[PDB]
Design a protein around this nucleic acid. Sequence first.
RNA 1: ACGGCUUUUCCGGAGUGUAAAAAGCUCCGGGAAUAAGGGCUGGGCAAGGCCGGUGGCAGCCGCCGCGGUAAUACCGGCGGCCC
RNA 2: GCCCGCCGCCUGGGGAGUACGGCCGCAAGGCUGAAACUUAAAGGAAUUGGCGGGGGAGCACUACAAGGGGUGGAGCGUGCGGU
RNA 3: UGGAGGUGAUUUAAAUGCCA
Lengths: 229, 36, 146, 95
Amino acid sequence: SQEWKEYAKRVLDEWQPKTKLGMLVKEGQITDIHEIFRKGYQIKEPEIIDVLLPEVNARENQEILDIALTVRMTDSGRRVRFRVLAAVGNRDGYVGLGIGHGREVGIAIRKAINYAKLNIIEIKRGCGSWECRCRRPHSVPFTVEGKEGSVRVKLIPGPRGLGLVIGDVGKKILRLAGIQDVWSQTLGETRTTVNFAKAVFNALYNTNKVVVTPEMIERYGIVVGRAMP
Amino acid sequence: MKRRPRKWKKKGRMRWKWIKKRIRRLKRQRKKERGL
Amino acid sequence: PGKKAPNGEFAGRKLKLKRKKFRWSDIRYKRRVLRLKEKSDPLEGAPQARGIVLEKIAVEAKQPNSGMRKAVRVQLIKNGKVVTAFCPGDGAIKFIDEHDEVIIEGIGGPKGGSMGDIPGIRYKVVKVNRVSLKELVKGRKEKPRR
Amino acid sequence: VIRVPLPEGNQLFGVVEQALGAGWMDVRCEDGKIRRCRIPGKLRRRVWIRVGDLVIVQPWPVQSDKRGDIVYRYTQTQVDWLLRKGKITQEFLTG
RNA sequence: ACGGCUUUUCCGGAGUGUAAAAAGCUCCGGGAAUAAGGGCUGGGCAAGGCCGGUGGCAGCCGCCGCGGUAAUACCGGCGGCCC
RNA sequence: GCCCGCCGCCUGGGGAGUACGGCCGCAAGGCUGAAACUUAAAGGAAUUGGCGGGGGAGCACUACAAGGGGUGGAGCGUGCGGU
RNA sequence: UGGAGGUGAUUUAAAUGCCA
Ligand SMILES: [Mg+2]
Ligand SMILES: [Mg+2]
Ligand SMILES: [Mg+2]
Ligand SMILES: [Mg+2]
Ligand SMILES: [Zn+2]
């Protein structure tokens, strides 16, 4: 994990902010990722995360779902541009997702890889299926659901070891956050890879929309972000 | 005539009123026409 | 619409009635109970049959293609029905003479109907005079009974 | 010599009595038989056919009455030149 | 390519098995000797931008789809992937 | 929209609201309603553009108005059609 | 800010289009 600390000294000196949060990370007060989120700041410059999540750029926390070209007409023929769906996040607890556009497949991919650096959000975890009574973050804690477009889906815990079981453009974006074993009930139309992606990721957001009282914390081993490096 | 209103849309067909009237001219027939 | 029809405790009888009725509006249910695939099926619902040939004709394909596929007409033995057999294998038509006993299979497409460009056929050849046709497609075997 | 498409092999001359329609061509040779020819998509495309437009055709061993497959109509440049030699006789059009 | 070694299998042979037999099964005697098809090879779906024939012709196609003289999508051959 | 009741219909598209049979009507007709087979999709909501014998804004002697001079009609030079 | 409804008007003779 060396290079992904060398990048900190490579980057922190080679950039001046244009926003404010830029400063409040550049000058040594806030230096730990998990204390910038739950306060309603704004993320507009895509380096603040790199300076604290410097493994997001590793070509392995990065995943590229699909390229799809779209068309429109003008009175001089066709005009055509690409959209790629790209998601990223370290393989510990944090994931982000972006679309982007552009007129060439490169510019598209890079633009999207950048957009998906800002939205990035964090999770909870657990193990609370009726079998894995263990307490180690290898499954989503409690059955929750999320909606988008014309697709609903509700995730269910499951025992340590049952391999990922969801559609083929869900296995990636579940693998990134490392959620390994989880069972799937689908509705709607799973053939627009986009709304699929966005609905799954929305559910994983909603993971933090239910109140778990003090005691239940030590029933499923809920965590937040990294746990036991 | 136990209407089925998906047909009036006139898309790739002909009007409905002026098809009913022509089916009558054959039901009145196969009833009258030696259907005795 | 409201909650649901007999969503009470005791009215299960009505509920079984509701399901027993609305089950019929299907299409695979009916085509089985009433056994309609039976008694409209020039083989009486079986996986193969034998026949005799009558002619040698040719058919044209779907709208956006071009060609004249060859075709034969078999007269069945099980029923006296007269059914339409297509034969694959380039130029296989060089062999099927008038009055040769042949075998007939399906073509296994949508619903069991036809497939591809030849829309009007439903039956293809496998064996002639007890000889597997794929052979004569690449020769590789000789032919009995002339 | 000259490229006037002599009936090669077993081509037939078809002067049409009427296009029975939609590719159906009721054609006529000097045989005694009145035929029903059919047309490809190559020439249903780039050329036009009318009554009195002689074409060459071919049979299939079926029925010896109504066969025929178009591979070249004739040209007005030779439609009558082919006569001066005597390769086509003109009592199969004119009563 | 050469050098060593093996004997489940295969040929001979005995014991033992069996109602009588046949198999098997312990021993010897021989010897790399006696032992490979099938389907695929345009996207679905692992796999050839490889060569040689064919001219909206022959043909392929579970669906969408190729064939107009320059075919990864036919016919071959050469390569190649799944059991 | 979220919760507790009962009820009637729909389950690719056509062939079809046809067929055969019963029930009321004086008639015209009305209520009940299948199947053989044929096809790969018919239908919805929105997005750019082209067009409109739809509406506004703004042009041009290869548009008109207002003026000047002509070709079409004759012979000939010269380019195409065709024979 | 945008419509949401109503009363009137609302114009001679103008048919059709292979081939990839
Ligand atoms: Mg409706
Ligand atoms: Mg090949
Ligand atoms: Mg592949
Ligand atoms: Mg008028
Ligand atoms: Zn666990």
